[model samples]
Structure formats: structure tokens, C-alpha cells
Target: NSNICEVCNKWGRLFCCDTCPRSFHEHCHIPSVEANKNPWSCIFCRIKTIQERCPESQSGHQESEVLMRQMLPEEQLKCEFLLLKVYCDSKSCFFASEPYYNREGSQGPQKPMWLNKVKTSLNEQMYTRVEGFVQDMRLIFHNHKEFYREDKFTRLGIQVQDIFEKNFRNIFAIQETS
Candidate 1:
């Protein structure tokens, strides 16, 4: 009796490779083909095959801006996060980028009337949200906290995360496994 290698099914200590750590029985690693009977591969070794198995994302792995437009009001919120990550460096940068330039090309609500009111009433809050969002992003090379010191980027992330997660669960989460 020997431990089965989690990867390659080759028998050994089953703990040899760290990168692709897998369990294997001593006999499985035997040079003789006849000595190695059952065939099984570990999750790690099979990753390459799995990686190639799935179809490539047609939307370039980012949320389709067009499809996002059709999403429910709440769903649109999560899509906003994805769009921000996939498309822009920061909100201000995004505003300065092509998306904002071409934003008028699409027809629909981008910044709704309500947001305008909030902008007027709580300019600091609105600015904080934008700053916080930029802060959480690992790609936001420059945080510029000094410029946004009065803002609460972390708190903004929480509010945005909550809204995005809530919308995602409501719109896409399957109720049952079947």
C-alpha cells in the first residue's frame, strides 16, 4: 500500500513538489510501466489542461460595456466596479480618459439626477468615495492621500463593496445547485 501522488499519479512521498504539491504512492513513481497500474493526476498537474479547456472570454475578460448597460439598476452597480477596474486608473483619470470622452456615445443614465444632488449636498462625501475607491485599487500607483486627506477612501470602498455585492447576489446568485 502506498500514498497516491496528488499530481501525475506517480507514487512517491506524495509531498515532493512544492509548486505543484501532490500526494503519490511509492509504487506509482516506479520506472517500470507495469509497476504503475492505476492512472490518476493531481489537481495541479491537470491545471494546464483545465486552463486550455475553457473557452476564452469573448468580452476580453472585462464586463461588456454594452451588456452592462442592459443590466438591472442594482446589477449595474457591480458592473461599475468591474468597469472601473478593467478600464481606468482612477475616477478622475477615468473622467479624463477615452471612456468619459466617449461616454456620451452611449444613451442612458450614467450619472443620474440623484447623484447630481448628492454631489451638491455632500461634495466631500462624494469626493471621499472616489478617493477611497482609488486607494483600494492595487493598480492605483499614486494614492495622493494628501490631496484626499479629508476624504475617507476606505469607508467609500465599504459602501461601494456593499452595494456591488448586494446587487451581484440579487441579480446573479443561483438559488439552488440544480
Candidate 2:
């Protein structure tokens, strides 16, 4: 029954859905809805949205690790695309720069995560495991919530997570396995 916008996970003037407790800001909707619309159904309750779902599969982690060992050409390109999308959505490149030296906000991530660190590792071909890349990416989101204490920065972080998920799933082409 969260009243906050699911897209950004922020509290503000929101439009509630007719079939669920989820709510969204006018621009937060998938197509950026106008305030003039009535009885909004949202991305979840709607039927025609060009959304893709990743099926429930056990331990893509195993596949992820295996895939990382080789670093396929397509996978590398996908990783690049995913990282770029996250940078585009983040607020003012906040995560790309080192938070520790910025001298604002809380004490920063416990393990000190910055997007450039992740990018550096990727560009240097330091990973033999995709899960490691994912781990660092998730850490950025986790640190945002911990540092911001679930406010504006946290909201933006959630949006970034959604961007990661949409791109990550397809990039991996996850599927059922025996």
C-alpha cells in the first residue's frame, strides 16, 4: 500500500491507480502521463504496455558466473550500455564522482562505492565474473539508501535500479534451466 511513486520511489503529489495501492507522479508514469488523465492504471495494471518480464529461474547466478569467465562481445557491449543508462538517470552524476571527497551527505558507503570505480574495473577488463559487476552496481543503490536515509537521493537510486533491471535481464537473456 505504498503511496509513493514506484518509478522513483519518492513522495510527492501522486496519481493513485484504480486497481492497486501503487501511485505515481504525473511524469513518473511510463509514458509520462498528463494530469488531465483519469483513473490511471499504471505500468503494472495495464495490458498494452511494451513491457518484458524475466521469468522465474533458479540460480542465474551460476550462468552469470560462467558467462563472466569469457566476457563475450555482446555481453561487454550490454554492460557498457547498462552503465551508460544508469549514468544518464542519476542525479547530476552524483554516483559517478567519489562521494567521500565531495564533503556532503552522510559518511558515504561503508565500503566506499563510486560509479567511476565500477566503470574503471569494467574498462580495465578486471572482471571474470558478471556477478561481481552486479554486486558493485547493487552496492551503489544500497549505499544511496543508507547515505540518504530514503529521501531524494534514495529515490533517484531506485530509478537507477529499475534501469539496471530492465537492461540487465535482457542483456543476460535469462531462461529456465534444468
Candidate 3:
């Protein structure tokens, strides 16, 4: 008698992995296999085998591609912007206006700020004006601040809060009226 299906845990016509000890019901396997292929392996086993054969450098590329594919255009821009932030942070350059400097005060070439770099990259990649992209990003940031109760000046401090309110007042007013 055949063993219970690994997936449904019930008696059924089961398929076993040729390379491993696991078995699954015909319907349990994703993209379920209908034909009996004698040398077939289960999904888990196949991934393990492929991962073993895949170069380490290329291993994460597929996952990143999938993630990017799932994101909206605006979200993708935000994602890339955040990735750029991490890159800048790793180099000890927190602001875009400042050049990265070594511990010994040896400065690298002056470059545009991370925000400007993100705007340029987005414009180049998405084929849009940077102003529109910046507006969208600011809206997203504002929404997040409001949602998290970070909208208060006390929380953000007077100077930064005043700047934010001044720049975003029109946007906020428009959103409120709608």
C-alpha cells in the first residue's frame, strides 16, 4: 500500500521525489504535475538542487527581480531610493550636499545629495520629470507621518516641521478638501 500524501496527509494517488524521500498528492504540488515522469523531483528538492548549481553571485538576483516586478512604478522608485540611501550610509555620507570623508578627513569628490541622485535616477529610468517624482515621494512621506502620529511639530522639532509644513501646506489642503 502507498503511504499517505505528504501534503494532504490522506490516502491518495501520490507522487514521490526521485531525488529525495518526500512524496505529495498530485494536486498538492504547485503547478501540479499530471504526467508520471519517473526522474522528477519535488519542488523543494528541485530548488535545493538548482540552488546548489547556481552561482552565489546570481542567487539573489532572481529574488530581487521578482520583488521589483511585484512593486508599482512609484513604489519601485521608492525602493530604489531607499537602496541608494543604504549605499550612501555605508560610505558614511549621510547628506547629499556633503562629500564623503575618511576618518583622516580625506574627502572624496563632491557629489549631489542622495535625494538629487534619486531624482535623477528616477527621471532617467522612469522617463518623467524629477519634480513630479519628488511631489509623489513627499505625499507618501506625509501620509506615513500622519498615519504614525508623527505629524506634530513637537515630534519633528520646530525648524524641520516648519519647513515641511510650509512646503506641503498646499498638498495637505488639497487632500483635506477631497
TM-scores vs. true structure, each candidate: 0.19, 0.53, 0.33
Looking at candidate 1, the ten consecutive residues that score lowest on lDDT are: 94-103
Candidate with top TM-score is 2
For model 3, give the 10-residue run with minimal summed lDDT: 169-178
Which residue pairs overlap in candidate 3's backbone?
96-113
lDDT of 3 by residue, 73-133 (tens): 5334333433332222222122223223333423332332333444445545652433444
What's model 2's lDDT at 151? 60
Q: Ten residues in a row with the worst lDDT in model 2?
A: 48-57
| Backbone clash count for every predicted candidate, in the order shown | 17, 0, 1
Model 3 TM-score (2 dp): 0.33
Per-residue CA lDDT of model 2 for 1-178, tens digit only, reads 5777765667998888876787777654534455665766654554213223323322344445535555554345456545655654636276777776343555656687877788777778776666677878888878877878746657877877787776676545555455
* Runs with alpha carbons beyond 4 Å of true place in candidate 2: 1-69, 90-92, 101-107, 175-178
Against the reference, the lDDT scores of all candidates come to 0.32, 0.63, 0.42
lDDT digits (tens) for residues 9-28 of candidate 1: 44545534333444544322
Query: What are the C-alpha RMSDs, in order, of all predicted structures?
Result: 19.9, 10.8, 21.0
